[PDB]
Write a protein that binds this ligand. Structure first.
Ligand SMILES: O=C(O)/C=C/c1ccc(NC(=O)C2(NC(=O)c3ccc4c(C5CCCCC5)c5n(c4c3)CC(=O)Nc3ccccc3-5)CCCC2)cc1
Length: 550
């Protein structure tokens, strides 16, 4: 069937990509899907189902589901918003209950969704190709979004790791992911790797793909109500349904993956993994290691020679294509792990304070920097700068520019202690900038505060990137950080820990850094469990057993 059908009603709103370029995107993501399954696909599917059988998932309470709702979550069309839900307002609660009862009783009626153009901020690039048409966001009403959590949050948290094991991308902290890739690359006698990119993955996702995904969730130990909810949600929401613009007008219909549902990450990860595992077999790739993050895929296998490797890669692509997962740019085999780019990241290595090698993830800074510039300019609700600080803590750019710029701003506005909302693997997080050292130590380790000996290639990328954006050079940043550090130190408590640890790089005479004792009390049990992009999940950072001297 067609991924989408349209009435012609415009996608209305509520550089930053806008609702103007929405029509250009619509044309790309709209097509009939052709899918042919085989025994390899069927086999891998049964192996996945067997691992799912071991999962037991629990039904979440209305209360449990509510607390998971982000405070700025899109308001319901039934007269309540995120605040009411979180507060367990009698109105919100009663509607949620009715929504639930309706999933338990109605098994066929399509549930309405809202289509919107995501206003993501990207850099002004006049050189290469074209100014990217805006990504689409499809989502049900807040009450449905709450019911999704009751029935499937435990499934989407537990099941992907049970099924995929170490191949599951979102189970890893940045350091863990790096360690996984390095060990896998080292594990091969003669390693070869590649990244496989799918052209509009969400659109290539068929209704059968969605039915197979439910067939996996149905292997869990579920409460009969959870079981029904999943059945009804698959039929009425996940396989497709009508599209409505922000102005209440009917836009058309969907028969592919909805980008803003709880099952988007999980479902996409499962689907991609299924197809890829099957395609590996079709291409006869030897000793495969996969790493899957939604639609993003990386394969590290044993090389069989440059000509053979290129051939098996075409084989893989042909199978993926038959399964309805064709590529954007066709895959290229790499024989350096640093050379594999996935989720825009790439492996780099630096040295610690004692000279030991340290692998870390990096990326080109152009987009994180431009988005940060947009954010300093206009008060955005959710802050990419803080997420990039967390994710790319060991990187040269995050330390020298992001940390320096934003810490001086919080000093100026006397707002170090004020919590901010940022993103980690699709989930929304409330984080106090004063907790950044503890968070960093727990996701990257002490070395993150004392990395040096950066590669000439990374230094140059950073240097160039600064030049093209009109950002002062790295020496200017060292001067500024020396001051930011001085001010943070003269404030004690967490502020001085930010000074000492985050800005140890800016001082010629480096301090010996010992572990932060309060870092152990940080509960990050919900942090690197799973991916929830479009999932509408919120976690406020909490601290189990606080000592007085802190
Ligand atoms: O010695 C040498 O050889 C050179 C020295 C030198 C060169 C330039 C300066 N710049 C400044 O002082 C000012 N800008 C900045 O001190 C500045 C800081 C961060 C900036 C950022 C981002 C960096 C990441 C965090 C968010 C802010 C951008 N731009 C920045 C400019 C340049 C800018 O204006 N906008 C953009 C646009 C896109 C991307 C980045 C930027 C402040 C007053 C006058 C302009 C200072 C010294």
């Amino acid at each position: 069937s067609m991924s989408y059908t349209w009435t012609g009603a415009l996608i209305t709103p509520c550089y930053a990509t806008t609702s103007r370029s929405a029509s250009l995107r619509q044309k790309k993501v709209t097509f009939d899907r052709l899918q042919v399954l085989d025994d390899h696909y069927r086999d891998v599917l049964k192996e996945m189902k067997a691992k799912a059988s071991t999962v037991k998932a629990k039904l979440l309470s209305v209360e449990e589901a509510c607390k998971l709702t982000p405070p700025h979550s899109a308001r319901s069309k039934f007269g309540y918003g995120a605040k009411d839900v979180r507060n367990l307002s009698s109105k919100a609660v009663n509607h949620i209950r009715s929504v639930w009862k309706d999933l338990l009783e109605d098994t066929e009626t399509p549930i309405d969704t809202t289509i919107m153009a995501k206003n993501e901020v990207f850099c002004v690039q006049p050189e290469k190709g074209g100014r990217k048409p805006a990504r689409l966001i499809v989502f049900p009403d807040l009450g449905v979004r709450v019911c999704e959590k009751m029935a499937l949050y435990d499934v989407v948290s537990t099941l992907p790791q049970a099924v995929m094991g170490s191949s599951y991308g979102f189970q890893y902290s940045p350091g863990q992911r790096v360690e996984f890739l390095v060990n896998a690359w080292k594990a091969k006698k003669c390693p070869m790797g590649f990244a496989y990119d799918t052209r509009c993955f969400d659109s290539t996702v068929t209704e059968n793909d969605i039915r197979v995904e439910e067939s996996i969730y149905q292997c869990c130990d579920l409460a009969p109500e959870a079981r029904q909810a999943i059945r009804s949600l698959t039929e009425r929401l996940y396989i497709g349904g009508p599209l409505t613009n922000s102005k209440g007008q009917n836009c058309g219909y969907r028969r592919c993956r909805a980008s803003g549902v709880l099952t988007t990450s999980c479902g996409n990860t499962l689907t991609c993994y299924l197809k890829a595992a099957a395609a590996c077999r079709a291409a006869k790739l030897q000793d495969c290691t996969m790493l899957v993050c939604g639609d993003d895929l990386v394969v590290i296998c044993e090389s069989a020679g440059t000509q053979e490797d290129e051939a098996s890669l075409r084989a893989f692509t042909e199978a993926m294509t038959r399964y309805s997962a064709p590529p954007g740019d066709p895959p290229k085999p790499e024989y350096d792990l640093e050379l594999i780019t996935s989720c825009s990241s790439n492996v780099s290595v630096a040295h610690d304070a004692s000279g030991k090698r340290v692998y870390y993830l990096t990326r080109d800074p152009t987009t994180p920097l431009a988005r940060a510039a947009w954010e300093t300019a206009r008060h955005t609700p959710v802050n990419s700068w803080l997420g990039n600080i967390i994710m790319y803590a060991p990187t040269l750019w995050a330390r020298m520019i992001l940390m320096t710029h934003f810490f001086s701003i919080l000093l100026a506005q006397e707002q170090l202690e004020k919590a901010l909302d940022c993103q980690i693997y699709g989930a929304c997080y409330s984080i106090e900038p004063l907790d950044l050292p503890q968070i960093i130590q727990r996701l990257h380790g002490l070395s993150a505060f004392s990395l040096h000996s950066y590669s000439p290639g990374e230094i140059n990328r950073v240097a160039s990137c600064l030049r093209k954006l009109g950002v002062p050079p790295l020496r200017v940043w060292r001067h500024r950080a020396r001051s930011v550090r001085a001010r943070l130190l003269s404030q004690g408590g967490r502020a001085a820990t930010c000074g000492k640890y985050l800005f140890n790089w800016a001082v010629r005479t480096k301090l010996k850094l010992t572990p932060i004792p309060a870092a152990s009390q940080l509960d990050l049990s919900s942090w690197f469990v799973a991916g929830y992009s479009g999932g509408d999940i919120y976690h406020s950072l909490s601290r189990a057993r606080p000592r007085w001297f802190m």
